[PDB]
Paper text:
PLLs are natural lactonases endowed with promiscuous phosphotriesterase activity. The catalytic center contained two metal cations coordinated by four histidines, an aspartic acid and a carboxylated lysine residue. A structural analysis of SsoPox, a hyperthermostable counterpart of the PLL family from Sulfolobus solfataricus, has revealed that loop 7 is shorter in SsoPox than in PTEs; linking the active site to the loop 8, which forms a hydrophobic channel that accommodates AHLs aliphatic chain. Indeed, W263 is located at the start of loop 8, involved in the dimer interface of the enzyme and positions the lactone cycle of the substrate onto the bi-metallic catalytic center.
Compared to wild-type SsoPox, variants W263L, W263M and W263F are the most efficient at improving specific activities, ranging from 30-50 and 20-35-fold at 1 mM and 100 µM, respectively. These variants constitute the Phosphotriesterase Selected Variants group (PteSV). Variant W263F is the most proficient (kcat/KM = 1.21 (±0.26)x104 M-1s-1), followed by W263M and W263L with increased efficiencies of 23.3, 14.1 and 4.6-fold, respectively, as compared to wild-type enzyme. The impact of this substitution is such that SsoPox-W263F hydrolyzes nerve agent analogs with remarkable efficiency (kcat/KM is 8.85 (±2.99)x104 M-1s-1 against IMP-coumarin), whereas the wild-type SsoPox is unable to hydrolyze this compound. The catalytic parameters obtained for CMP-coumarin (kcat/KM = 8.23 (±1.04)x104 M-1s-1), IMP-coumarin (kcat/KM = 8.85 (±2.99)x104 M-1s-1) and PinP-coumarin (kcat/KM = 7.08 (±2.58)x103 M-1s-1) hydrolysis enhanced catalytic efficiency 10- and 60-fold compared to the wild-type enzyme for which no activity was reported for PinP-coumarin. The variant W263F was also assayed in the presence of SDS, because anionic detergents have been shown to increase the phosphotriesterase activity of wild-type SsoPox. Interestingly, SDS has lower influence on the kinetic parameters of variant W263F against paraoxon and CMP-coumarin (with a catalytic efficiency increase ranging from 1.7 to 6.1-fold) than that observed for wild-type SsoPox (ranging from 6.4 to 12.4-fold). Thus, the W263F mutation might then mimic the SDS effect, by bringing local flexibility into the active site. Regarding the PteSV group, while these variants exhibit higher phosphotriesterase activity, they demonstrate mild improvements for the oxo-lactones and no or wild-type-like AHLase activity (W263L-M and W263F, respectively). The diffraction data for W263F and W263I-C10 HTL crystals were collected at the Proxima-1 beam line (SOLEIL, Gif-sur-Yvette, France) using a PILATUS-6M detector.
Author numbering:
A (entry chain A), B (entry chain D): 1 to 314
The structure:
């Protein structure tokens, strides 16, 4: 009775256990799928998601937090099917994922109207179901904090203040967007500790990463396997350094793995080059063993994968 | 055997009869409706579309061309239901309606891949049905001809050359986007006579409008009732002037009426000042009577509403 789960009763934060804080069962462009369904194969998508989740659970993963929201093809019914097939604790969210402008629907609509949509999903349920959103997801990338991106950020603050659900962000590690997201949210009264600033693992700029952590938010070292952003070994060195410097209190680790994704970039021919080892279990195969080889004890691993997600949702 | 119709056998273009070349039974943002279905009322959308179409048919309209495509919430099954309830000849299209960037799906995808989507809808059918697209719709607006906007334009040209279907455009009457669309399309081998450059009625800049007609394309005096773009009176003066100057064989007239539309701008509160007399029959109430009482004979009216559409689809 605190964090809502897809297809299950809500749980107290103490029960979320070992968590992958940022993974995607399936990503797609809503308009493209609606207009050209011939491009997609739901049987295969389902098989891929179930296979990945099952493998994560074999390594001891108990909860997966999936920040697929509007703009990334959130489908609560698909998520339900995956839960039924696996027994995973799955946390779904609400929010809006844009880089530049909002859909035309939002022309001449207020920040409050936007926040009302998030609050609907949190208090009433997602897409006509009784599965409730447990967090709000927002984004900014290369384009920076555009007017509409800012509106969404402020709407998320409103939803958090009314419901107390935490906020997960997508940012671009190289252009200050994460720092700006944290600034706007905290200025609007969001507890910095209820924010995860995403994709900071995409850079080895430790000063930037620490600056965000020092302002009180979790830092998302959350794209392990996506070498095109930063290779696994560079990520490992950055993660280790932050741990040695005492930042385990703010570190969160994940893969941002998409079991299926429709971006032209994610075509299989590009995988060997851009993300050869990208999967939902890479951190068990490489990262965690690497950290242990370098003196990181199990208490720090537990802090990152258990205590931190617990605090985030408490 | 020439123009495909939703829910009917195809017709020869000679049988198209009195036509409204640009109207929308329903417009919505795919992503918003997918994520927040509570915002929408299907019963109300259906009743409104049926009511409008019936009233148009009472005024003698035989065929409505509906350029709702990806980005505007095209729904071929909704369209089928409206046809069943009214008996209207309805021409559905394919294409992509964007102002800035394409959906993330299109990252690292070619112009050919986009064209293939349009060719699919034209040759195979729309959204898993055998209802086929009879034209391609593209857009550009305030942001101008962005990189992605241009990709879509070039994809439409490929689709036209392969299938011979005409092209309808959305443009902004004040920033040369219409002229640019025409230029790129014609450079890529599209017959200027198979292009309708849209929303030119939004300006009283007669020289700009004529330039597009002179280069061989139909001109869309197609937003009658939308005073926020240009009041009915100013539209009528422009239309009349063009006819007197000998442009009736390039003129097409419509309302761009949306029987339902989800833009925040379309809230009923704004209707009195933004579009007080806007409907799918405004031209029968105001425009055609205005033209006829100003020296425009029955042959010219037939050219605009019967001959030009026939030629466009021939
Ligand atoms: Co992200
Ligand atoms: Co338009
Ligand atoms: Fe993600
Ligand atoms: Fe339109």
């Amino acid at each position: 009775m605190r964090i809502p789960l897809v297809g299950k009763d809500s749980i107290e934060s103490k029960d979320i256990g070992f968590t992958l804080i940022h993974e995607h069962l399936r990503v797609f462009s809503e308009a493209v799928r609606q207009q050209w369904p011939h491009l997609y194969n739901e049987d295969e998508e389902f098989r891929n998601a179930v296979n990945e989740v099952k493998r994560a659970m074999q390594f001891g993963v108990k909860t997966i937090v999936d920040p697929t929201v509007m703009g990334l093809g959130r489908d609560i019914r698909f998520m339900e099917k995956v839960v039924k097939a696996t027994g995973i604790n799955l946390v779904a969210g609400t929010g809006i994922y844009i880089y530049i402008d909002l859909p035309f629907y939002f022309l001449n609509r207020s920040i409050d109207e936007i926040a009302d949509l998030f609050i609907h999903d949190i208090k009433e349920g997602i897409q006509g179901t009784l599965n409730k959103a447990g967090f709000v997801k927002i984004a900014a990338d290369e384009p920076g904090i555009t007017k509409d991106v800012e509106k969404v950020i402020r709407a998320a603050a409103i939803a958090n203040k009314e419901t107390k659900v935490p906020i997960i962000t997508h940012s671009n590690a190289h252009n200050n967007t994460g720092l700006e997201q944290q600034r706007i949210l905290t200025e609007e009264g969001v507890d910095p500790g209820k924010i995860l600033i995403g994709h900071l693992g995409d850079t080895d700029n430790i000063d930037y990463i620490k600056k965000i952590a020092d302002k009180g938010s979790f830092i998302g070292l959350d794209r392990y396997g996506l070498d095109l952003f930063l290779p696994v070994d560079k990520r490992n060195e950055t993660t280790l350094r932050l741990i040695k410097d005492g930042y385990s209190d703010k570190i969160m680790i994940s893969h941002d793995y998409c079991c299926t994704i429709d971006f032209g970039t994610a075509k299989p021919e590009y995988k060997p080059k851009l993300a050869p080892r990208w999967s939902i279990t890479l951190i068990f195969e490489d990262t965690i063993p690497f950290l242990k080889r370098n003196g990181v004890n199990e208490e720090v691993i537990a802090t990152i994968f258990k205590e931190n997600p617990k605090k985030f949702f408490s």
